[PDB]
């Protein structure tokens, strides 16, 4: 789909058998979902934003459904105010910046 | 252009008569500039993101150039790690997911 930005950019994930939204972000490198519960092993990560940093838990070779599309890869799971997609993720369901 | 999204989307950008790059930020409402010299009346506002809050100086009417494309809008500085073109801006310049 093309999506324009004159709303926040917000879809439908699905993941760890739960549906959820999350923003499709640009300025993320990573992808950051807010505390939920995720199966197997993860380590523990810090991550740095605007305002300071959080603690985070990382999830490798996740499934995720992002807007029908599948995908997988490293999740990071914490106190992150939004559910953000990031460019880890948005690089395999195809997704590009047009202008 | 179009703009994949294996490297972070860094445009160059110029405001105040200065040149500097910027990330194309569809996860930012607003647009975030490191601390730079803008002329003018400003105000006070607090901005939060993954870590906590940041104070900045927000400006409005602000002309700005981003890839070519002029775009006039509001612009926030103040300690922000990296600077960032949020979807206030990114709306003018007609930024999507095209192809
Ligand atoms: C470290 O330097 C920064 C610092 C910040 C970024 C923009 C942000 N992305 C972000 O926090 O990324 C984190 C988690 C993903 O992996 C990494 O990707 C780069 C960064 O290191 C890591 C994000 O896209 C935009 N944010 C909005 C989010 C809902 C919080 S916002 O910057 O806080 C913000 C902008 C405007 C506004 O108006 C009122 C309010 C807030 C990118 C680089």
Redesign the interface.
Known sequence: ??????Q??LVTIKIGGQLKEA???????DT?LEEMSLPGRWKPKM????????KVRQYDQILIEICGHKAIGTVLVGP??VN?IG?NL??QIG?????
């Open positions: 789909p093309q999506i324009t930005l004159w926040r950019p923003l499709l972000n640009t300025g993320a490198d950051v991550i740095g934003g605007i305002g300071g940093f959080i992150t105010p953000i460019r948005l690089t997704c590009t910046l047009n202008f």
